[PDB]
A paper describes a structure:
Metallo-β-lactamases (MBLs) enable bacterial resistance to almost all classes of β-lactam antibiotics. There are two mechanistic types of β-lactamase – the serine β-lactamases (SBLs), which employ a nucleophilic serine (Ambler classes A, C, D) and the metallo-β-lactamases (MBLs), which utilise a Zn(II) bound hydroxide in β-lactam hydrolysis (class B). The enethiols inhibit MBLs from different subclasses. Crystallographic analyses reveal that the enethiol sulphur displaces the di-Zn(II) ion bridging ‘hydrolytic’ water.
Previously, we have reported crystallographic studies of VIM-2 and the BcII MBLs in complex with ML302F and in the case of VIM-2, ML302.24 In the case of BcII, a single ML302F molecule was apparent at the active site. Unexpectedly, when ML302 was co-crystallised with VIM-2, each of the two molecules in the asymmetric unit had ML302F chelating Zn(II) at the active site. In each MBL the thiolate interacts with both Zn(II) ions and the inhibitor carboxylate interacts with Zn2 and (Lys-224 of BcII/Arg233 of VIM-2). As observed in the VIM-2:ML302F complex, the plane of the phenyl side chain on all of the enethiol inhibitors is rotated about the C3–C4 bond such that it is not co-planar with the plane of the enethiol alkene, likely hindering conjugation. The use of a 1:1 mixture of ML302 and ML302F (ML302M) manifested a > 20-fold increase in potency (IC50 = 1.8 nM) compared to the use of either ML302 (IC50 = 60 nM) or ML302F (IC50 = 40 nM) individually against VIM-2, as observed previously. However, the increased activity with the mixture was not observed in the inhibition of the other subclass B1 MBLs (BcII, SPM-1, NDM-1) tested, arguing against the formation of a ternary complex in these cases. This observation is consistent with the results of our previous study, i.e. that a ternary complex can be accommodated by VIM-2, but not BcII, suggesting different binding modes for these two enzymes. We have previously reported structural evidence that ML302/ML302F can form a ternary complex with VIM-2.24 The SAR results presented here suggest that formation of such a ternary complex is not a general feature of rhodanine derived MBL inhibition and hence, although interesting, is unlikely to be a productive path for the development of broad spectrum clinically useful MBL inhibitors. Superimposing the structure of BcII in complex with 6s and VIM-2 in complex with ML302F, implies that there may be a steric clash between the naphthalene side chain of 6s and Tyr67 on the L3 loop of VIM-2, suggesting unfavourable binding. However, the BcII and VIM-2 IC50 values for 6s are comparable (IC50 =  0.2 µM and 0.1 µM, respectively), indicating 6s might adopt a different conformation when binding to VIM-2 and/or that it induces a conformational change of the VIM-2 L3 loop.
Numbering used by the authors: 32 to 262
The structure:
Amino acid sequence: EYPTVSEIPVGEVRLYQIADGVWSHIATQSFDGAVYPSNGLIVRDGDELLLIDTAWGAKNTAALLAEIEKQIGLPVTRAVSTHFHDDRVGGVDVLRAAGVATYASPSTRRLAEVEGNEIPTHSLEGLSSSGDAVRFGPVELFYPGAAHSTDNLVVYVPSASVLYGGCAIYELSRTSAGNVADADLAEWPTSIERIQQHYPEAQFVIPGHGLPGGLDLLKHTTNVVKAHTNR
Ligand SMILES: O=C(O)/C(S)=C/c1c(Cl)ccc(Cl)c1Cl
Ligand SMILES: [Zn+2]
Ligand SMILES: [Zn+2]
Ligand SMILES: [Zn+2]
């Protein structure tokens, strides 16, 4: 029932209800002649919504907002980008022009600036050291350490036991490493270990791209990363 890469045409956005007031949003994008899926999260915050990550681009993000307006009908007041790559911050300008307050760690904002990507406005405090956790409305933000990127955060929704690992977590069908240009391969397994240590009760784990599963995705990503390490 979860929408796959092949069912979403580029430009469109699907929403998937996970629990009471917890959705993921799924989009697609073309890169080097191939089509990739991309996940984000939507968490109800009273009568407002917390957005996790853009839909990979200005066009997709504008369509994500229109789809939230149509399907949920509650305002997105804040948004967090979980690291600095285009699939997480591409569309921040759209969010900001819509009146959304955009957030990311100081590291993420700096790395986005250096990369020439869109820069979230607000700086998240309390996430400077590996293992740091901070509450942000209806979710907990967690810096597990460097993994897919030095700045990657993961998001936990306590009300529904939903762990959003972002691009630090691979889907099961991905058996080889993606683009690891900005990754810390040496530390990636340890960082996943921290996620496991801090959210062992997680029932529903969302990767940055592809289908969700359980906590098996953590060990799965460790296997792929270590396999790539021995390439
Ligand atoms: O594998 C991933 O999860 C990501 S975000 C890969 C990537 C990188 Cl490393 C740089 C740039 C862009 Cl656009 C993307 Cl998609
Ligand atoms: Zn990335
Ligand atoms: Zn503001
Ligand atoms: Zn990604």
